[PDB]
Write a protein that binds this DNA or RNA. Structure first.
Ligand SMILES: Cc1cn([C@H]2C[C@H](O)[C@@H](COP(=O)(O)OP(=O)(O)OP(=O)(O)O)O2)c(=O)[nH]c1=O
Ligand SMILES: [Ca+2]
Ligand SMILES: [Ca+2]
Ligand SMILES: [Ca+2]
Ligand SMILES: [Ca+2]
Ligand SMILES: [Ca+2]
Ligand SMILES: [Ca+2]
Ligand SMILES: [Ca+2]
Length: 901
DNA sequence: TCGAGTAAGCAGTCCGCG
DNA sequence: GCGGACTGCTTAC
């Protein structure tokens, strides 16, 4: 097999590389890599190396990496550009793996671990590590085993061994319900003392050294705790054994307020699953506790226990160990579904970077572009410093707030990447500038043609047309991968809808789910077999289809993220190819494209409707238009349609056969106007929206920019078994809005769009009457909590104190003195509740850590003093009043003459 | 919240507005 | 009471 790296590091003048050799075995090597860098030279000097602008360079070969770094510094002292890849390990990977890497994941040791630390006096700080580590569960992907290290004797209690038999039993048997599928995979090791536990863990780690190291909060908690505890007991040299090269660095990480420490383990790639989840999941969660996320992702019940976690080991060591094991398993289950490790490996090997660098699109793209240029013997420019400067973005149309009955939407496929490719925007394709007219003049096609030679953006920039830039070339490659995965995702989605339909008529039989590839649209034969299947088999198939859809979603949306982040990197001062001229060329072209096509669509529809000045485009944001279809439906007449699906078909056909060709003609003209390299503006239909045929539903409404709801029957070619709400920006979509309130507002919206005013009024009246019975967590607001210290003046709110921070200060006074009470962590999320006048907490609100029950010390009093009236008004009535006033509906029945009878 | 970008919405504070 | 200046937070692209 072809060799591939596992990890790479620079340590002084050596590269340390762990790799898989041609026989599939893990090896390590130290290489005295001599890096090269480059300086500009005279034309009279014969060279093969040129910078991206075509200027000749001489290659400087250094005796070692330190010599190279020193040269860069002296070049700065002289005032001359030092060209080339200054991150020497990326140059090493490029030289050592000069081919497309094919990796074999089965050979990569992926370790997933979690530790337990009993602490009586509050949160056990990793930097201090003052308490014994009393459990470690470490799952190894190569062995497929859970290695459990269990401390039986501690200063906080001596306990009996954990029992695998009880662990396996149902909770109704007094057991722990450790999943039966992992029972046989547990290797249990009890220890009489912590010193032996840790020495054995280190010997184990040496034998089975992680390449990828993951878990939940492993980077911020488990790793620094283990390192520091070992350091405290044995000394630094022993703790450094967590690195295969015995090198570690305390790394200080900082944002806007304050900083924290992590331990860099040289020769390991730490991908903390909480951070993978945050970057790649496209959620914003009220809580990031593993319990909360596991419940959300997997629909598994919260791991229940009596009393605080600080007393769990002494009171129920059995459950304590089983819960540690289950926690490790939960992360593996989340990864089986979301596949973020697979994503990271794919992206990392594609770019030829340390796998942990997938968190940085700047590093990822720097490596991709360097590798690409190096292939042509071209030399990358030196990174420079730039001051942070603002630049303009997208155009968003101001919608008239209203109900909108029939709507068809359209938006550009990968808009900004497509603009980059179409215009040929790249650092080395800049050709010059032209005199800019006001944007309105380009939108209306009255400005003079920018260039008859070069490809243009309405910000004034011109680009070469003779050859593709490296940015267009490389962005296209990732875009093509994105397109492939999106195809699989949508097929799985369409397949899911087939199963949902079949589930209306399940067969009374005993059978099996069909063995199929959900990434491909079901054949006629498969469809026929599905119609004969039982509910059990159909539901299993649906689950599998939905898992395939999620897998495709991860692969496609994060490739979309990668290419969109190349655009974004052009506007980040740390990117080697930072250039506000190029970032603004993209955004200004975007503004033109949207407004140009708005004009074209309005013109087209006015023509086919025989009107003048009618605005068919009611809204658009960045690269999208929303077209009112009322007049199209009315041209045929509603009574002509057999059912909802009939008019959906009709609008679908109209969009595909009439609208899209008109849109395409419009953009081709724009391409010619701007003299672009290639027409790539592809504005495909997104949604077909409207009320159910014959209902009183309003179909859709807008309240403002970035705030709307549509009742959708077809989304990008997926014809739903049941209509689905597309809601953007409204409170149902915000993580700050209480859970039960999101749910209620969504049902209000459903009723508005599908059923009408009277249905809405019925539901509202019921919710208002019953909501005080809702569990307090479900009606609590959520907020991130930054700068608690800033607004804390002797335990009381300082000037301009935010509402949620005020709540935290209230909480802090109420739990004062107790080291046992959960502390609100700076920068994390809190639940927030309003409190009635005269309450014993002495302020108008209280906040506590999100994803948790408020501590028993104050729970009863919070429950007694919760201000339900304020809750309802702020979170439910105010937003609902917004939706209904926009839609020109009333959520409460107004008086009429009929009342008199 | 270490980690690519801008536009733009709403909650809340402070305080004017005769 | 609402609206502007401002902070804080969050979402649509
Ligand atoms: C979602 C998103 C969009 N954008 C910008 C670039 C996008 O091309 C543009 C339009 O956003 P989208 O319409 O959300 O995405 P897209 O057009 O790139 O891809 P597709 O519609 O095919 O799924 O907005 C970002 O810069 N960052 C982002 O995270
Ligand atoms: Ca735990
Ligand atoms: Ca788009
Ligand atoms: Ca599309
Ligand atoms: Ca059937
Ligand atoms: Ca869009
Ligand atoms: Ca009490
Ligand atoms: Ca206001």
């Amino acid at each position: 097999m072809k060799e591939f790296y596992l990890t790479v590091e620079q340590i002084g003048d050596s590269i340390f590389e762990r790799y898989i050799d041609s026989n599939g075995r893990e090896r390590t090597r130290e290489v005295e890599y001599k890096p090269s860098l480059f300086a500009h030279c005279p034309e009279s000097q014969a060279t093969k190396y040129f910078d991206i602008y075509g200027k000749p360079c001489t290659r400087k070969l250094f005796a070692n990496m330190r010599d190279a770094s020193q040269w860069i510094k002296r070049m700065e002292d002289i005032g001359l550009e030092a060209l080339g890849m200054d991150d020497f390990k990326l140059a090493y990977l490029s030289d050592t793996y000069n081919y497309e890497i094919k990796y074999d994941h089965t050979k990569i040791r992926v370790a997933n671990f979690d530790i337990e630390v009993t602490s009586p006096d509050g949160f056990p700080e990793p930097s201090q590590a003052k308490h014994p580590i009393d459990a470690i569960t470490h799952y190894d992907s190569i062995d497929d085993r859970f290695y459990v290290f269990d401390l039986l004797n501690s200063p906080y209690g001596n306990v009996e061994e954990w029992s695998i038999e009880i662990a396996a039993k149902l909770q109704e048997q007094g057991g722990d319900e450790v999943p039966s599928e992992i029972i046989d995979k547990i290797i249990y090791m009890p220890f009489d003392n912590e010193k032996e536990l840790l020495m054995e863990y280190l010997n184990f780690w040496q034998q089975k050294t992680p390449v990828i190291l993951t878990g939940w909060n492993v980077e911020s908690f488990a790793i620094p705790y283990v390192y520091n505890r070992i350091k405290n007991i044995f000394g630094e040299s022993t703790a450094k054994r967590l690195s295969p090269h015995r090198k570690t660095r305390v790394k200080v990480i900082e944002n806007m307020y304050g900083s924290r420490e992590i331990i860099t383990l040289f020769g390991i790639s730490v991908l903390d699953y909480i951070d993978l989840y945050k970057k790649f999941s496209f959620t914003n969660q009220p809580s990031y506790s593993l319990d909360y996320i596991s419940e959300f992702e997997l629909n598994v019940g919260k791991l229940k226990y009596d009393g605080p976690i600080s007393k769990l080991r002494e009171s129920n060591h059995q459950r304590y160990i089983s819960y540690n094991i289950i926690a490790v398993y939960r992360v593996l289950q989340i990864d089986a579904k979301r596949q973020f490790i697979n994503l990271s490996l794919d992206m990392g090997y594609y770019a030829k970077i340390q796998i942990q660098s997938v968190f940085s699109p700047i590093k990822t793209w720097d490596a991709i572009i360097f590798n690409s240029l190096k292939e042509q013997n071209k030399v990358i420019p030196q990174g420079r410093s730039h001051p942070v400067q603002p630049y303009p973005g997208a155009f968003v149309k101001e919608p008239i707030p209203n109900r909108y009955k029939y709507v068809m939407s359209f938006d550009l496929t990968s808009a900004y990447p497509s603009i980059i490719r179409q215009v040929n925007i790249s650092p080395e394709t800049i050709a010059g500038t032209f005199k800019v007219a006001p944007l309105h003049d380009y939108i209306n096609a009255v400005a003079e043609r920018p260039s008859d030679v070069y490809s243009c953006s309405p910000n004034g920039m011109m680009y070469y047309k003779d050859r593709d830039g490296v940015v267009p070339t490389e962005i296209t490659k990732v875009f093509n991968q994105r397109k492939e995965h999106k195809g699989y995702m949508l097929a799985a989605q369409r397949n899911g809808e087939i199963i949902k339909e079949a589930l209306h008529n399940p067969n009374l039989s005993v059978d099996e789910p069909l063995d199929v590839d959900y990434r491909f649209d079901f054949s006629d034969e498969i469809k026929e077999k599905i119609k004969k299947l039982s509910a059990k088999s159909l539901n299993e198939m649906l689950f599998r289809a939905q898992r395939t859809e999620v897998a495709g979603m991860t692969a496609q949306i994060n490739r979309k993220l990668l290419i969109n982040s190349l655009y974004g990197a052009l506007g980040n001062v740390w990117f080697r190819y930072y250039d506000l001229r190029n970032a603004t060329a993209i955004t200004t072209f975007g503004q033109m494209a949207l407004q140009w096509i708005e004009r074209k669509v309005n013109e087209y529809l006015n023509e086919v409707c025989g009107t003048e000045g009618e605005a068919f485009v009611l809204y658009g944001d960045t690269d999208s238009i929303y077209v009112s279809a009322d007049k199209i439906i009315d041209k045929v007449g509603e009574s002509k349609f057999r059912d909802t699906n009939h008019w959906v078909d009709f609008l679908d056909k109209f969009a595909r056969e009439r609208m899209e060709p008109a849109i395409d003609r419009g953009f081709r003209e724009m391409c010619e106007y701007m003299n672009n390299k290639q027409h790539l503006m592809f504005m495909d239909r997104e949604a077909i929206a409207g009320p159910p045929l014959g209902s009183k539903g309003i179909g859709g409404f807008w309240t403002g920019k970035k705030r709307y709801a549509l009742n959708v029957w077809d989304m990008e070619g997926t014809r739903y078994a049941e209509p689905k709400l597309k809601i953007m920006g409204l409170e149902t979509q915000k993580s700050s809005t209480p859970k039960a309130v999101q749910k209620a507002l969504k049902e209000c919206i459903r009723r508005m769009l599908q059923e009408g005013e009277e249905s809405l009024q019925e539901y509202f009246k019921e919710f208002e009457k019953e909501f005080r019975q809702l569990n307090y967590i479900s009606i609590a607001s959520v907020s991130s909590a930054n700068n608690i210290a800033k607004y804390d003046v002797g335990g009381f709110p300082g000037p301009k104190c935010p509402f949620h921070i005020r709540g935290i200060l209230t909480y802090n006074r109420a739990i004062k003195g107790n080291i046992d009470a959960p502390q609100v962590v700076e920068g994390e999320k809190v639940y927030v509740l309003p409190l009635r006048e005269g309450n014993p907490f002495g302020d108008k609100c209280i906040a506590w850590p999100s994803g948790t029950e408020i501590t028993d010390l104050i729970k009863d009093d919070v429950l007694h003093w919760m201000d339900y009236t304020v809750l309802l008004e702020k979170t439910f009535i105010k937003p609902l009043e917004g939706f209904t006033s926009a839609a020109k509906l009333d959520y409460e029945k107004k008086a009429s003459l009929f009342d008199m009878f």
